[PDB]
């Protein structure tokens, strides 16, 4: 009847640094899934599923 | 009745710093499916699904 | 009837530093599923499953 | 009389990431000096003296 | 007479990540001197003095 | 007569990751010296003194 929120933080990233120094970065891919490199990502789902860094070879499902 | 939500925060992505040195880069696809260098992402999703680095790669479901 | 919260924080990242330095990065991938890097990720999901770093090989479910 | 000098690196800052979230930040000087938050400097001096972040207060030498 | 230097780094700061959260930060200075916060910070000097964070109250050196 | 320096590394830092959370700080100074909060820092001096963090309350010489 009196729900209250006053500084509710959810599904958040804050205060963040990266560095990266690579000198050859190669990805070769042939009929597969390749997910690299994800950073500082955030997600708040409400009924309903939630995934950020997913990866699905490949389905076969014939007839 | 009386539902107060002052300083709700859902979903977010605040005070990033992100330095990134490469030489060389590459990516060779052949028949897949590739996602990389995702940064600083933010999703909120209300009654459905939500995917943020997703890669599939390849359905047969002949016939 | 009277729900208060004040600083609640659920699924949250804050206050990361992170450095990488790598001369050779490579992936190679043939079929299958890679997920690689996944740095300073947050989710909250309501009634809903949640995956973050997911990888599947292939499904071979014919006929 | 061959000097050969070729990737030479001298008085170098590279590959920097920060992040400052404050509140509140205050500084209140009477009669000195004050020097805060000096970030990513580079310096080469040659045949002369080299300073980066320096404070003095005060200095009395009458007659 | 064949002096070569291929990949000489002198006086170099490289890769740094910092975060720095504070809610309050206050300096009071009276008559004095203060130095804070100093990062990333390179410096070479010949045939001179090299100095990088340096405070001195006061001097008195009268008549 | 061939004085050879490939990778000659002299007062160099990296990879350097620092994380800093303080609810308060506070530095009252009346007539001395304070430096704080010095990092990721490099220096070569070639004929001269070197100093980084150095601090001096007060001198009295007169007359």
Same mark, same amino acid.
Not at 22 to 31: L, P, R, S, Y
Not at 37 to 43: E, I, N, W
Not at 45 to 53: H, L, M, N, P
């Given at each position: ?10 599904? %958040? $990233?804050? @205060? /963040?640094?990266? *560095? &990266?120094? =690579? #000198?050859? !970065? ?6 597969? +899934? %390749? $997910?690299? @490199? /994800?950073?500082? *990502? &955030?997600? =708040? #789902?409400? !009924? ?6 997913? +990866? ?8």
């Amino acid at each position: 009847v009196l729900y209250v929120g006053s500084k509710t933080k959810e599904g %958040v $990233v804050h @205060g /963040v640094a990266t *560095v &990266a120094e =690579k #000198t050859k !970065e190669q990805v070769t891919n042939v009929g597969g +899934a %390749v $997910v690299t @490199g /994800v950073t500082a *990502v &955030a997600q =708040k #789902t409400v !009924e309903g599923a939630g995934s950020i860094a997913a +990866a699905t070879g490949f389905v076969k499902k014939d007839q």
